[PDB]
Design a protein around this ligand. Structure first.
Ligand SMILES: Cc1cc2nc3c(=O)[nH]c(=O)nc-3n(C[C@H](O)[C@H](O)[C@H](O)COP(=O)(O)OP(=O)(O)OC[C@H]3O[C@@H](n4cnc5c(N)ncnc54)[C@H](O)[C@@H]3O)c2cc1C
Ligand SMILES: O=C1NCc2c1c1c3ccccc3[nH]c1c1[nH]c3ccccc3c21
Length: 521
């Protein structure tokens, strides 16, 4: 019977993210996955900027960026009648090599299709990953969990003893079901096909017209994205199952007489499900097992990676012994509302496409179809089409309102686009300490107290943390620009990079503050 602190069920992006977070917190763990880490049908390709900030923390951001996506491939989204047909609307998004690094983050989004990401993540996790292994059954005990690890090549079964079991086993989570936890549908389930294909000369023919993603505007079945996966000949076409031959569907979508090789054609379900509970005893749900949503926006894998990072520090805190008895409970308390609002935002992007009218005369050339296209273009812009491709709020703007956060007033009524804020509950904002060091590079270990222009009360804060063995680092900053951004003289940041408390003056009961933020109050 082999034993580990945490047993991770699932070796997809989410499970691997949790493994990386545990390794960087020196927590003993183990990943088991039914597969080798070779994706035959790559699904996801876009990694959001918050996820990249986390990959930067874990030291794999650089290798993700240099993994093979061409620096000169356009990142645009465009709506067209057919690929190589008439163009209706385009959002220019530059290239990797030419776009300006954004002011609010050191890590812009990245393209890394699953068949590059999987081996790259397998490499950084090392031998703690266990491939071709399935979990057949588990049993909860008082101080640990016991599970059955059956080798898929061999057929034989083994036993693992872990303090905690974390289920990252996808949208049809067998773990979730065996716990009796429901995940009701919040919107209609839809059926689509994914056609993966090679088209080696397509990029050359498109030339200036190339895009990261095309939205087709052909028929009721072909109104969905066709995306360039590796920028080197690999593409995926999304086809709706309303109630045709694979090659023929691609031919309809692409108005070039060019080489096309269909690799696979697989059906998938678009679902909107969030679990009623994210844990039961020592068993935790994360990733799709906890929450699935519409990929329209690319929020799904990023929400999972963010949840993995949240669960990660709390598990570590509990195993170290400085956590309060209620800390683990805040995982569901904080992350579940995040899944819900992300789901609903993803569904808005989806409905924009589903409700969009495809008027007659759209495909006809000349002056009349040219006018019709120009009219639709105007309606596309007014519908907020670019929000699907520029959504800082969904990536950076979630604000925790929980029992371990010393929250401020304000309601939830937006007044402008998202803007960086150091308010309690929120992601502490990026700024350049030096040209090489971000404020983000201070976070990710224990708690951090950022003080501007002073060290008053700091010795007291340190003692209060030490008396409960809670890890704390204190940093003094003298940049007025950074002080203005954070708006307060003292800012207390959590192990996950979110603010727990801020103020011009430290509280009188520093012990009460400590117990509060560790989940003991
Ligand atoms: C077509 C499509 C496109 C998408 N595009 C994007 C995108 O561009 N950006 C984005 O952010 N998100 C995207 N998503 C969402 C993304 O796919 C999911 O959020 C994510 O893949 C799920 O994370 P996960 O690792 O928890 O689940 P999975 O990726 O399903 O991980 C499950 C893994 O666990 C293993 N496993 C399962 N059961 C067992 C068992 N009993 N024993 C052992 N091992 C087991 C399996 O081997 C599997 O590899 C997309 C989704 C789809 C369907
Ligand atoms: O990666 C994807 N895979 C599918 C997908 C994806 C993305 C997607 C990925 C990154 C950014 C925006 C995105 N919008 C969509 C999408 N909008 C859609 C509408 C109908 C059917 C599928 C999609 C869709």
């Amino acid at each position: 019977p082999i034993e580990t602190d945490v047993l991770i069920l699932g070796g997809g992006p989410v499970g691997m993210a949790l493994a990386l977070d545990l390794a960087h917190r020196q927590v003993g763990h183990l990943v088991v996955d039914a597969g080798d880490g070779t994706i035959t049908h790559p699904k996801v390709s876009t990694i959001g900027p918050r996820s990249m900030e986390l990959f930067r923390r874990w030291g794999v951001a650089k290798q993700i960026r240099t993994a093979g996506w061409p620096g000169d491939h356009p990142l645009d989204a465009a709506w067209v009648t057919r690929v190589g047909g008439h163009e209706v609307y385009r959002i220019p998004l530059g290239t990797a090599d030419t776009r300006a690094t954004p002011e609010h983050t050191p890590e812009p989004d990245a393209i890394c299709p699953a068949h590059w990401l999987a081996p790259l993540l397998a490499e950084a996790v090392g031998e703690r990953l266990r491939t071709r292994s399935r979990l057949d059954s588990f049993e909860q005990r008082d101080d640990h969990v016991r599970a059955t690890i059956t080798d898929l090549r061999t057929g034989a079964t083994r036993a693992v003893h872990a303090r905690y079991l974390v289920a990252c086993d996808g949208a049809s989570s067998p773990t979730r079901k065996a716990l009796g936890i429901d995940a009701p549908p919040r919107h209609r389930t839809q059926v689509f096909r994914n056609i993966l294909f090679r088209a080696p000369e397509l990029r050359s023919l498109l030339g200036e017209r190339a895009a990261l993603v095309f939205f087709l505007m052909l028929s009721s079945s072909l109104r969905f994205p066709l995306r360039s996966l590796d920028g080197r000949g690999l593409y995926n076409l999304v086809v709706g199952v309303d109630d045709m031959d694979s090659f023929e569907l691609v031919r309809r979508a692409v108005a070039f007489d060019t080489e096309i090789e269909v690799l696979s054609d697989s059906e998938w379900h678009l679902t909107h499900r969030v679990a009623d509970s994210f844990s039961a005893g020592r068993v935790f749900l994360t990733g799709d097992a906890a929450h699935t949503l519409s990929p329209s926006g690319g929020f799904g894998m990023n929400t999972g990676i963010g949840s993995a990072a949240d669960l990660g520090w709390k598990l570590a805190a509990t195993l170290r012994g400085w956590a309060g008895p209620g800390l683990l409970a805040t995982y569901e308390e904080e992350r579940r509302p995040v899944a819900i609002t992300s789901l609903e935002e993803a569904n808005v992007n989806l409905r924009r496409t589903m409700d969009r009218e495809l008027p007659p005369g759209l495909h006809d050339d000349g002056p009349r179809g040219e006018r019709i296209r120009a009219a639709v273009a105007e309606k596309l812009e007014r519908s907020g089409a670019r929000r699907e491709f520029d959504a800082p709020g969904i990536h950076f703007g979630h604000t925790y309102r929980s029992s371990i956060v010393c929250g401020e007033p304000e309601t939830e009524v937006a007044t402008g686009g998202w803007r960086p804020s150091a308010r309690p509950g929120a992601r502490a904002p990026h700024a350049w300490l030096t040209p090489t060091t971000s404020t983000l590079d201070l976070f990710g270990r224990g708690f951090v107290l950022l003080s501007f222009g002073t060290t008053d009360g700091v010795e007291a804060v340190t003692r209060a943390f030490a008396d409960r063995h809670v890890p704390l680092e204190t940093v003094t900053c003298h940049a007025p620009e950074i002080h203005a951004l954070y708006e307060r003289a003292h800012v207390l940041v959590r192990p996950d990079g979110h603010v727990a408390w801020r103020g011009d003056h430290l509280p009188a009961e520093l012990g009460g503050l400590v117990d509060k933020v560790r989940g003991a109050a």
